């Protein structure tokens, strides 16, 4: 029944941007993340 | 659980640098790098 996913964006780095998300899962995917931050703005 | 959006190209710019290599190792803003993303993005899934 699933067990994986997950997603968010944003990005940027140096530049600025921010967001976050992260997940994984799907039968030994891994993953993590779990935030960011910001930055901002965009969208 | 909802969600959508999809695009992006590169595996998400590899899953976003793999999240700022992991947030910069916990560094709270301090180092950096990155350098992609854009869109949108979105997601989803979930289950079980």
Same mark, same amino acid.
């Given at each position: 029944?699933?067990? $994986?996913?997950?997603?968010?964006?944003?990005?940027?780095?140096?530049?600025?941007?921010?967001?976050?998300?992260?997940?994984?899962?799907?039968?030994?995917? $891994?993953?993590?993340?779990?935030?960011?931050? $910001?930055?901002?703005?965009?969208?």
């Amino acid at each position: 029944x699933x067990x $994986g996913x997950x997603x968010x964006x944003x990005x940027x780095x140096x530049x600025x941007x921010x967001x976050x998300x992260x997940x994984x899962x799907x039968x030994x995917x $891994g993953x993590x993340x779990x935030x960011x931050x $910001g930055x901002x703005x965009x969208x």
